[PDB]
Design a protein around this ligand. Structure first.
Ligand SMILES: CC(=O)NCCc1ccc(S(N)(=O)=O)cc1
Length: 152
């Protein structure tokens, strides 16, 4: 059958919202009130991959747009990019590995590990208005934990 998807927003554990930073980047900033319309709505697809009770493979497409978060090497480093796809073929259940995140639920928070690059995580900075990026430790000063909000 089709692939199943949910509309959602994400906030980092310091409660920073995610917005577009030009066409192929997201940034994280503190948002409240009218400006909350500026947040990206993810279509989170539940995709093929290794799965356990608390580790669920997803793709983070942007709702209504043929864009996906993806993990690739850039100048020899695992990086997070927004990648365009053929809108006729996406979403699909068997998403390519660069698009897959393991959504991990620990202590009422979510982490998104790259399926492609083990122990690399969707990350934000503590500073306002900095890129969302792929970071190589769920440790340290950078933020690797999120909450999801469901959208109609
Ligand atoms: C049903 C509902 O609340 N839709 C939100 C509208 C909507 C908001 C944001 C985006 S995006 N992916 O471009 O950031 C798409 C649609």
């Amino acid at each position: 059958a089709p692939v199943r998807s949910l509309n959602c927003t994400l906030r980092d554990s310091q409660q920073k919202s995610l917005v577009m930073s030009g066409p192929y980047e997201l940034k994280a900033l503190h948002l409240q009130g009218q400006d909350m319309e500026q947040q990206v709505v993810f279509s989170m697809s539940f995709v093929q991959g290794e799965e356990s009770n608390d580790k669920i493979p997803v793709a983070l497409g942007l709702k209504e747009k043929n864009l996906y978060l993806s993990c690739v090497l850039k100048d020899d480093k695992p990086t997070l990019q927004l990648e365009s796809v053929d809108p006729k073929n996406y979403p699909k259940k068997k998403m390519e590995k660069r698009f897959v995140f393991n959504k991990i639920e620990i202590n009422n928070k979510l982490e998104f590990e790259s399926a492609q690059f083990p122990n690399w995580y969707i990350s934000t900075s503590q500073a306002e208005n900095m890129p969302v990026f792929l970071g190589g430790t769920k440790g340290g000063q950078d933020i690797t934990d999120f909450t999801m909000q469901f959208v109609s």
